[PDB]
Symmetry: D2
């Protein structure tokens, strides 16, 4: 077999014994194989993601199947176009080897390696989120994560924060339902959550929501099943997916879009760009199908180093003015400059399948081969012209610069409708899980949280208020003042 | 209450809404509060420890109680001397938020903030280790850790490695016994593993092993109890410890030493500086007592950032020539330069309780206030004399520089001793756990592993061979050729 | 006091490594050798991407006027005295580059105010070369040494600048003798952009800041530059540190130029264009600064200071100048990298008021947190905002867009500047610019010369001769340019 | 080709940021503005702790002797052609520091051999100032600019060197005109230390390496230094890059001086003392190097190359020189920080042979691993060692120790050097040392003078004059110094 070498290519003569000053003597500083193997070892780890640290990556392909040229000019949506993908599924709060049975929303991020560049659709199984403005994301994550004093879960903290956040009511209803503990990533849907802005070749815009429909169906664990699985397997989602792909049982999802024109936004009773809302009566249209059929070759180089970011957009796809999405356009590229580095987008899993041509340079571990003296634009010696067809869409403005919440909140209606859509057994599990989680919250926050659940549906609030030992008369009088 | 501020101290006007271009417009880049909060958030995480990433830190005090001036000049051992400590307990292989029920050795690292500087005793509950030379450490960890292709446990990998490592037999016997799954950190002992060299005021040396004897007793979980605990609690060791301290029930450990003179080592049939060995008949002497009685204030600032390293030594305590230990003198300080930074030892939790006076300077995030022009030694303007009493001890040398295994291995005797010391019930649990783990290893490595167990004790090897489905006749013939 | 390791243990020998016998190899277990070398091996951090070469000093600012109608900031309250940290610098070259190299010179002032830290990061030139921060990286890459060799190559800047008529004014300032100061004490400081001051009623004013040197202005001419460089590559640092050591403390008066929001539309140029001065707006004195103390340690203080236009206090906000808007992001961003997440907690960067927020962890966090409340809002440990500190509201119209400003006036002020120079000052300018332009590609060179010609026919004509451009092509090119 | 963003998407407008209307603020969603500024903000990495100012060129080495009796290394096989990367540098000052400043000049060569990459990291000076690596951080700290002001302050290095008599020989080379070369092309290079060469029979030889310039040696005297500095702060880079552009490729012959292990105890000095040359050992030529190609990109190649004495191939090992021993640790260590754990996988650092080991992960890992076997040994995917590559064995005796070498001889070789200088060179040497020593504290100054006086009474006497030392004290201190 080929000889073991050091990183400079030199063969190693003994990989079992350190060089010592005699049989009973100390180790020498000059043993370069010892030093190099330990300095590499000592530097293998990089920071985990600040959220969604626990994840599983797989590869597959997406094939478009409809004519949506009237909605978007992006080549990924052209009927019959087959684009390779990289998908990273994940939980949200806990560290990287945390039990996959822990209750949480699950991430569903798809990197499309399109012919116009890489587009990332960074979604979750839940179609709505807990907040509507990215300025609260650091606050929200800090409240959800383990207590900073102990590294132990302490749910009284998320309910202190969330008692000030009535808009979280619908998504907390998902979290504490059995949708919070899936049986496999193959048995969950995916949603973009926000409305994205699709732009056609005439410069016209449509606001669109994306949904991945599982062709395997939806399968969740109930709290007693969660405990049985957790007893022997702390990686059941990863085992399920990797194992399925090894057996050739490739999971698939159909992609659907819901569409609104800019002039329809103001007609609704809720704000269509509020990330805490679904669009209940807008029809869905199928535009493609993705199949995930290949495992990764190396977890660290692919799954750990993949950089998913809503900022990775192609002409024809832009962010909407959803205020949650707006901060996401900054945050992922920013964190990835730190987690990976300035040259993170040049790693194999992050590279586009098209040419990159710009003046960005240098930075740590630059692996390029540059020969030109022109790293500026414009240049008449080595021009790099822009493409006028790729200019951003123009959105009309009015009012003033401002710091004010959106005007139509409707914080409790959709939560109530979701609660009522649940089977009797689903409601029972949601009520017992939410109540157990809320039981030792401070009394003031506890009765305020329970007022939101009661305003969503009196049966929901009454039952969680019994489990959590809240004060039902205070819950009802607080709920009476809440506005629809 | 005090107004929320930005990091430059300027008060914040609205922490709930980002600044937007009208009520329906996009978010502005000039919103410095949004951008600061997101950039700080985006940079919260640092690399986890390459091993022992899952850990719990607490604080307490150690009080010495014997006259060991004959063995060491170090102040921490002076009778009645009280020294504050920081202890970090941990598992080894998996990451943060991995289940604390996972089978593994457990770390027991004590930072003593002595009156002569900080001394770290970085030990484990197991008194022996799997390998005896630090050049194999990276290989050993890579074999134990989850498969690099999938991030899932795959014990065929560790047994392909350990089939070439007959010296791992005794510690794999501890690993697969119920000592591999403790009921609490308070119910385990701690050991230095290596002999350390204590030096007295005359410059004379003694080799000593350290043992923390639990005053709460030893309590382990058997396989069925592990699954039951894991079903509901993935942080059972942290909860147990933080819990006890909150209730005032402070865990204690008596510190004992085993002592051998330099001239006695050659008389043993095993090498006393072999990390795979205990010293079976050397008497123990109690030298002090440690009580852990305070939880940390902030997990990140203290438990995550603490830097435990065998290199943090004080005059009177030095590393022995144990070849595993020698590598550890280099590796912890090296990985901390990366994980923390060049200024990592100036963080609050890592600072000594005595003055630091040297020419080490600059480096990222230097928080000092230097006024001198003298950052070199020697200097006649601002001298920094050495202390001739702190010169290292002189060890006699013989032979040549070399790369060769130690001359006495005795790889199976102590492992058989350990097996035979176990109760019938403990034997059954060991055999079932080891055999289930080994069952899908490649046949050649599996029968070689079994031969090691059979040579330790024929009953051990026969029973694990039945559970693992190895070939007994091949096991017996391979064992017949093994040497004692 | 005895020499120690970083753990506080005393060192027994700091002159000899531990070796295996008199003729033998060095031992891995010598922890003093390893810890000194590992710290030494990690002393350096990335230099600033621009302005790497700099000098820092400390002093104090005292406000002297009632400007409460313009800003509610406590720093400007007449009589208020505020400690300052100032960093002066060059722009293009590395940290030990000669201080005589031709460049704009930075003048950044960190005010440790009673409302928090406010940084006024300006330059001695009152105008900049570009007017939209999206071009900053390109501009800097064209100015810096050639990426192939690390050697100055002025044809690269004129290839870029031939597309940028808006750089005419400041290029005139660069190639003049103001491009090579005699001391930092002998130069003015300008904020360049208009900032928006907001008073206690919420009213806004657009203001320009100017530091007037009370030592006067003193530039070196070309011949004096080579003379000084021959023996001194740190002449600016030497002058300032030496002057403070002798007790000759340099002082600057701070002046403001003021405009109301409804006045911006009435000029022939865009008042928020960073390549423009405000020629006819009167100046008012609002305070004075004295720099009277040298630093204790260059690295801890001068190298680690983090100056950023985003360090704002109530009463001061960015204007819509498109150059400034980019700077509000870039400084804080690069400091997260060059220093780290906890860079603003280093001694030189800390404010003199408490910091109260949920920002946490990050590399080398030196705090002492005990609370479980790292989120807002909380009813257990609230951290209320102050409604009085809400940002001002600017009226908007039109659409989101990617389009240059409409009033450019790229040559007029460039010409006024040229013609304002003495005959000798003009001669030096023409020769420095023309020598720098000489080997630019012919198309860029004659386009550059057209911008100078459009500014002032004598200017363009004299540089064309030195630089060897085609006078007739310059004149026809200039014919097609708009004032 | 069309400009793109880093994800490959085409840019529609690289001239204007996206704003909220023509007079409105910039938008956070303009991903091109943010990605360009984020990349620009992170361009710089930490400069080398020493030798930050450098120039890199490429070339080829051709072996021309049969030295298989001394080393089994393929690089030295007669007729063997190996590609090289060479980086020349100054030592003490930061990037863009004047290349005329007085220092030793680095001469590092990376040989991309058929057995792996071998780096010969040398200098023009054949000796060094100190002899144990434990003092290296102290020495560098004393040599660099004062930590309080970032200005050169030569009193600091003499405070330090007044305790270091062994630096006399190299301080003599430093203050001579060898300290200011006219080009890297006109300077020799030396490995300084003895290296251990090992042949195919396991036999060892101690060897010194010397690169003989085939352009001759060309220095600048103090008056010429000032002239070049007045106008050129990159004279060495210019000279070397320009020479190669013209086709005038510089050449160096490689020579070795050989000693057997039993010969080291014979001499009156220690042959592994880095402050010593080997005066009477003869030199044999073993090959020639020609540098004939410039780099394509300065940052990717010259800034990112990783030169380290730890990059060894079979046939070559460190000797027991105590300064060399620390260098085996420190270069790889600083490169783990300056570059990263994956720094040896960058294009310029990669070997021309396959790398096969279980080193993995780390920041920005660009590999394409498929195996699950990242440990050794393995019976599934074995990675056997080669017994012929085992390290050589050195006989030991004594005990572990912290004690200076015994045969110091700190002054004789320095005096020898001085006496070989022409009258011109002696006067230049004397004026510079004296001028640098001038404001040192009297006690250190007179002790430095004693060392010079002990090397040679005229040296001592002539430098004590310029520096204003006290000759009677110098002579009585010198009286007591031993040979
Ligand atoms: C609709 C709401 C959101 C969804 C669906 C979502 C989804 C996700 C997913 C799936 C990932 C993991 C991607 C991967 O597998 O690598 C992730 C990571 C992340 N998210 Fe979000 N998230 C949302 C809200 C936010 C917000 C509001 C912010 C901040 C402004 C944010 C910041 C981050 C960060 C910093 C990471 C780590 C990325 C990395 O290190 O590569 N997210 N998110
Ligand atoms: C007797 C054998 C060993 C014992 C008892 C042991 C114990 C420990 C413990 C208790 C910790 C965690 C300290 C904490 O809580 O921060 C640790 C971490 C670590 N150990 Fe060991 N270990 C052993 C062998 C080794 C060897 C041979 C090496 C390498 C030569 C090594 C390298 C490391 C590293 C790099 C870390 C991470 C340190 C950090 O990031 O702060 N260990 N070990």
């Amino acid at each position: 077999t080929d000889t073991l070498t050091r990183d400079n290519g030199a063969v190693v003569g003994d990989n079992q014994n350190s060089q010592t000053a005699g049989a009973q003597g100390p180790v020498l500083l000059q043993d370069v194989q010892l030093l190099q193997k330990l300095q590499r070892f000592d530097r293998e780890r990089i920071p985990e993601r600040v959220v969604h640290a626990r994840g599983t990556g797989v590869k597959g392909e997406f094939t478009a199947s409809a004519d949506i040229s009237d909605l978007s000019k992006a080549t990924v949506f052209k009927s019959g176009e087959k684009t390779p993908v990289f998908v990273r599924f994940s939980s949200v709060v806990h560290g990287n080897h945390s039990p996959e049975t822990l209750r949480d929303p699950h991430g569903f991020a798809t990197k499309f390696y399109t012919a116009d560049g890489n587009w990332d659709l960074v979604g979750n199984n839940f179609p709505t989120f807990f907040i509507r403005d990215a300025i609260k994301f650091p606050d929200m994550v800090h409240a959800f994560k383990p207590d900073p004093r102990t590294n132990l879960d302490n749910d009284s903290r998320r309910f202190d924060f969330f008692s000030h956040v009535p808009e979280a009511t619908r998504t907390l209803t998902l979290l504490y339902s059995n949708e919070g503990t899936p049986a496999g990533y193959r048995f969950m849907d995916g949603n973009g959550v926000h409305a994205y802005k699709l732009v056609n070749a005439k410069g016209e815009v449509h606001y669109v929501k994306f949904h991945w429909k599982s062709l395997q169906g939806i399968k969740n664990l109930d709290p007693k099943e969660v405990a049985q699985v957790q007893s022997k397997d702390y990686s059941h989602l990863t085992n399920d997916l990797v194992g399925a792909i090894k057996k050739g049982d490739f999971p698939k999802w159909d992609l659907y879009v819901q569409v609104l024109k800019p002039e329809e936004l103001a007609k609704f009773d809720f704000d269509p760009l509020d990330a805490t809302k679904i669009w209940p009566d807008v029809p869905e249209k199928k535009i493609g199908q993705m199949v995930l059929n290949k495992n990764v070759d190396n977890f660290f180089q692919e799954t750990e180093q993949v950089a998913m970011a809503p900022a990775n957009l192609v002409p024809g796809i832009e962010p909407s003015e959803d205020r949650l999405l707006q901060g996401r356009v900054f945050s992922y590229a920013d964190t990835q400059m730190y987690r990976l580095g300035a040259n993170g987008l040049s790693l194999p899993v992050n590279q586009p399948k098209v040419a990159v041509n710009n003046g960005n340079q240098d930075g740590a571990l630059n692996t390029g081969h540059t020969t030109s003296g022109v790293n500026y634009e414009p240049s008449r010696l080595e021009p790099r012209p822009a493409d006028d067809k790729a200019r951003y869409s123009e959105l009309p403005l009015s009012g003033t610069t401002q710091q004010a919440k959106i005007t139509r909140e409707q914080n409790f209606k959709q939560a109530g409708d979701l609660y009522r859509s649940y089977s009797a057994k689903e409601k029972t599990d949601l009520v017992q899980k939410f109540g157990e989680s809320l039981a030792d919250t401070l009394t003031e926050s506890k009765n305020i949280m329970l007022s939101y659940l009661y305003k969503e549906d009196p049966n929901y609030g009454t039952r969680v208020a019994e489990v959590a030992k809240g004060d039902l008369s205070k819950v009802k009088s607080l709920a009476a003042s809440l506005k629809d």
